[PDB]
Design a protein around this ligand. Structure first.
Ligand SMILES: C=CC1=C(C)/C(=C/c2[nH]c(/C=C3N=C(/C=C4\NC(=O)C(C)=C4C=C)C(C)=C\3CCC(=O)O)c(CCC(=O)O)c2C)NC1=O
Ligand SMILES: *[C@@H]1O[C@H](CO)[C@@H](O[C@@H]2O[C@H](CO)[C@@H](O)[C@H](O)[C@H]2NC(C)=O)[C@H](O)[C@H]1NC(C)=O
Ligand SMILES: *[C@@H]1O[C@H](CO)[C@@H](O)[C@H](O)[C@H]1NC(C)=O
Ligand SMILES: *[C@@H]1O[C@H](CO)[C@@H](O)[C@H](O)[C@H]1NC(C)=O
Ligand SMILES: *[C@@H]1O[C@H](CO)[C@@H](O)[C@H](O)[C@H]1NC(C)=O
Ligand SMILES: *[C@@H]1O[C@H](CO)[C@@H](O)[C@H](O)[C@H]1NC(C)=O
Ligand SMILES: *[C@@H]1O[C@H](CO)[C@@H](O)[C@H](O)[C@H]1NC(C)=O
Ligand SMILES: *[C@@H]1O[C@H](CO)[C@@H](O)[C@H](O)[C@H]1NC(C)=O
Ligand SMILES: *[C@@H]1O[C@H](CO)[C@@H](O)[C@H](O)[C@H]1NC(C)=O
Ligand SMILES: *[C@@H]1O[C@H](CO)[C@@H](O)[C@H](O)[C@H]1NC(C)=O
Lengths: 250, 299, 49, 50, 50, 50
């Protein structure tokens, strides 16, 4: 494939990840309760790497599940790649959306150095496909305004993908609001994932954070939706709320 | 003489009610048990199964399993259950190595080619195929990994073929001394020893009563009786109680609702998508006021 | 009632989180939108005489 | 006390009916015994505190 | 109380790490449950006496 | 005076039965033993159960 030469980039930006990175631990309906659960979560108020498209994307390690998020207005950010070597020697998870059908593959891929789709044509993101073991395709379809926050994790052979899509009116940085991520897909792949990369279709930016094994308190309201949460071991106040099993401390 | 808060024996349920999804499709048991080709162990096949009724009586009529070991679900209770997801991990192995297909076991198969979670729930089914897969002169279409740099994870499929550096000699990924080809083959002959005969194995992995059920056992459904304490069964979740109408905004992926006590509070009927709260039959204490015996028996 | 003024203040200051001393069957079966704590206790053999 | 009904006490599940619908006596009774002793322990603790 | 940490409570050993380094979940958890219930029993007894 | 890999037996041998009491095998790699005695003999096939 082609190689990029002209780059208008900067050193990787950093921001604060807070009030985000929480997902439903299971598929049970419970309402007006406080439930404690221990799992890999995004620690609140941690440091999250902020990337921009030049005005390309590096490959990042996949440590025990990754939180991804990005704000969008023209569907630039069109997929991800996961694997260890990413050169067709091993199976590599591929997720793509070429404006028609979301495609999921585990084929052995010779990935292009510089993914790009479409401006309005030229699907050029890989150059090999052999010994494949999975394929999924959906049905046809056609400031930043839509925030999409995903969690990608790999636990005992299942690649679990949680997601949340919301409307927004904000361009500068991540919002200060709270939103829980529903479970969307669980794929049995059986793949050893260690490194990953994103996909652009060539204003654009995204944020990547890393999960840690933490205990969290989750608040289900009268409609069974997560409205708030407390990190455990974030700080003495949160630890007090965590041991007391309450969001209010006297 | 006095008052006594007596135990609650007055009411006992009389009948049973069975409710299941309304699926008439027969499950493709044949395509996995009756298959021309099984996957090799290093590249074991994983088949999603869905939209199924599971009778396992065709296998009774024709097949004969050498081993049927179920973890987490003893088989006799298998008829009256429904499953959230079902994955059939199908492959072939050597006869002795059938022992290795189990949680907590180790071996070449357990370590390099296939692995189960220690918390696995589901059934391992194995039967010999020495008269079908094997052939005179050997069968080299079934391979397995013999060396790996480290141990496997559960349900991890490593189809890599690159050279393994057994020694400290870096042989550039090409064959050489102290570094060999990880994949090896069995020589299956119909006259070979029992421990060397090929065995077809299928592992049905699922997880119970935590999500909507689309596959289920063969029990037929019944009509529902409200405002009466009955022995109910919804998608394999059994119980006893009074079923009453309710309003609950269940999410599409949510099948059961639970109260503070994490007991099932309400169920979404699989056939008619309405939510019914369950309440215990013997609600309400009963206290007996009486004069002491030796005087009267009125109470 | 024959409660005094001060007694009225006392009863109105301390809160008795038990839904009173009456909670009928139908009261719980109609209170399906809140999952009252007392109903949950009552359905598990826990009663307040 | 009611929250202690959510405890598995080392069992596969906190629900009796799930165990009984999934498991059969020879090894089901062990999980049932575990739940029974856990819940009876919780009751004994509650009564002692009372 | 500290001496009760030496008790096996019917387990193979009183040390958690020995069990975990020797045994794996499907039957290790049983011994761990035995130790946990024994030690929690000792704590409950101590708190009651206090 | 041993290091125990049991990978040579993997490369060549094929065991009909491997039953470990007190030590589930997957935790066997990360353990060291005080004493080790190999009681070797031959028997009839059924009597392997005994
Ligand atoms: C690449 C994987 C991918 C996933 C996992 C995915 C999930 C997903 N996206 C959806 C909506 C949608 N998803 C998109 C676009 C995207 N959403 C994305 O995650 C990405 C990367 C894009 C493209 C850049 C749009 C435009 C909608 C409809 C929003 C609307 O109603 O306007 C829906 C709901 C389907 C519906 O109700 O119509 C799902 C399940 N879409 C995808 O393309
Ligand atoms: C998944 O892939 C990673 C990366 O190759 C493996 O970890 C490496 O393994 C090699 C070989 O033993 C070591 O030399 C490296 O030091 C390891 N790196 C890290 C970061 O661990 C890992 O072993 C693979 N998973 C499995 C189950 O084999
Ligand atoms: C250039 O492209 C080739 C493939 O055509 C690739 O092997 C090489 O790594 C690329 N180099 C750069 C600097 O992008
Ligand atoms: C990440 O942010 C934290 C504060 O949130 C800061 O202390 C740390 O230095 C940042 N990381 C880097 C590499 O600067
Ligand atoms: C790209 O979109 C076309 C048109 O819908 C579709 O046929 C194709 O499958 C998509 N790409 C891939 C890799 O599937
Ligand atoms: C919960 O749902 C009800 C019914 O749709 C609605 O009236 C209420 O506003 C919802 N709760 C919130 C917090 O919006
Ligand atoms: C299944 O659903 C249909 C429509 O909801 C209903 O009419 C029918 O009685 C149900 N049961 C069967 C066995 O079809
Ligand atoms: C499998 O094949 C045998 C013989 O080929 C046949 O008798 C049996 O019915 C088949 N199984 C099923 C489920 O049809
Ligand atoms: C991969 O495919 C090639 C042919 O394209 C084949 O020779 C090789 O055996 C395959 N490897 C695996 C692991 O299936
Ligand atoms: C019980 O009955 C006996 C004989 O009928 C009588 O002597 C005794 O007084 C009675 N006791 C009471 C408490 O009534």
């Amino acid at each position: 494939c082609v190689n990029l030469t002209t780059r208008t980039q900067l050193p990787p930006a950093y921001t604060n990840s807070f009030t985000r990175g929480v997902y439903y631990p299971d598929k049970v309906f419970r309402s007006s309760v406080l439930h404690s659960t221990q799992d890999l979560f995004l620690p609140f108020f941690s440091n999250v790497t902020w990337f921009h498209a030049i005005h390309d994307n590096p490959v990042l390690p996949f440590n025990d599940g990754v939180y991804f998020a990005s704000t969008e207005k023209s569907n630039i950010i069109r997929g991800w790649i996961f694997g260890t070597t990413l050169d067709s020697k091993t199976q590599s998870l591929l997720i793509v959306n070429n404006a028609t059908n979301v495609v999921i593959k585990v084929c052995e891929f010779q990935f292009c150095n510089d993914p790009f789709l479409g401006m309005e044509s030229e699907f050029r993101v890989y150059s090999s496909a052999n010994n494949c073991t999975f394929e999924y395709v959906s049905q046809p379809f056609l400031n930043f305004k839509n925030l999409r926050e995903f969690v990608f994790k790999n636990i005992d052979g299942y690649f679990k993908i949680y997601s949340k899509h919301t409307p927004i009116n904000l361009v500068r940085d991540l919002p200060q609001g709270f939103s829980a991520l529903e479970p969307l897909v669980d794929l049995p792949i059986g793949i050893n994932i260690t490194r990953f990369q994103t996909l652009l279709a060539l204003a654009a930016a995204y944020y990547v954070g890393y999960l840690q094994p933490r205990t969290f308190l989750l608040k289900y309201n009268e409609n069974g939706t997560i409205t708030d949460a407390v990190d455990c071991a974030l700080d003495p106040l949160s630890e007090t709320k965590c041991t007391l099993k309450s969001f209010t401390v006297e | 003489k006095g008052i006594y808060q007596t135990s609650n024996f007055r009411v006992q349920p009389t009948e049973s009610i069975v409710r299941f999804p309304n699926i008439t499709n027969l499950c493709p048991f044949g395509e996995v048990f009756n298959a021309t080709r099984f996957a090799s162990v290093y590249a074991w096949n994983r088949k999603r199964i869905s939209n199924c009724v599971a009778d396992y009586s065709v296998l009774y009529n024709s097949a004969s399993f050498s081993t049927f070991k179920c973890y987490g679900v003893c088989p006799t209770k298998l008829n009256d259950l429904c499953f959230t997801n079902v994955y059939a991990d199908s492959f072939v192995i050597r006869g002795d190595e059938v022992r290795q297909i189990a949680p907590g076991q180790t071996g070449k198969i357990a370590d390099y080619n296939y692995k189960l979670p220690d918390d696995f729930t589901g059934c391992v089914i194995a039967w010999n195929s020495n008269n079908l897969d094997s052939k005179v002169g050997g069968n080299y279409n079934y391979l397995y990994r013999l060396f790996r740099k480290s141990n496997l994870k559960p349900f991890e499929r490593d189809i890599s073929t690159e050279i393994y550096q057994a020694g400290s000699t870096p042989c550039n990924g090409v064959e050489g001394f102290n570094c060999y080809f990880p994949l090896q083959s069995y020589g299956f002959q119909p006259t070979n020893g029992v421990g060397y005969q090929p065995y077809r194995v299928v592992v049905l992995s699922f997880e119970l009563l935590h999500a909507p059920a689309t596959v289920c056992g063969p029990k037929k459904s019944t009509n529902l009786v409200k405002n009466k304490c009955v022995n109910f069964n919804f998608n394999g979740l059994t119980g006893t109680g009074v079923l009453t109408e309710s309003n609950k905004k269940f999410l599409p992926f949510q099948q059961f609702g639970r109260d503070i006590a994490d007991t099932t509070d309400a169920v979404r009927d699989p056939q008619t998508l309405e939510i019914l709260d369950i309440t215990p039959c013997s609600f309400g204490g009963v206290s007996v006021i009486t004069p002491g015996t030796n005087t009267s028996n009125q109470v | 009632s024959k409660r005094s003024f001060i007694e009225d203040l006392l009863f109105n200051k301390v809160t008795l989180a038990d839904a009173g001393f009456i909670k009928q069957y139908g009261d719980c079966l109609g209170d399906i939108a809140a999952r009252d704590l007392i109903c949950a206790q009552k359905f598990n053999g826990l009663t307040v005489l | 006390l009611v929250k202690q009904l959510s405890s598995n006490f080392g069992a596969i599940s906190s629900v009796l009916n799930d165990i009984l619908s999934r498991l059969c006596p020879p090894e089901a009774e062990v999980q049932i015994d575990r739940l029974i002793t856990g819940r009876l322990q919780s009751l004994q603790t509650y009564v002692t505190q009372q």
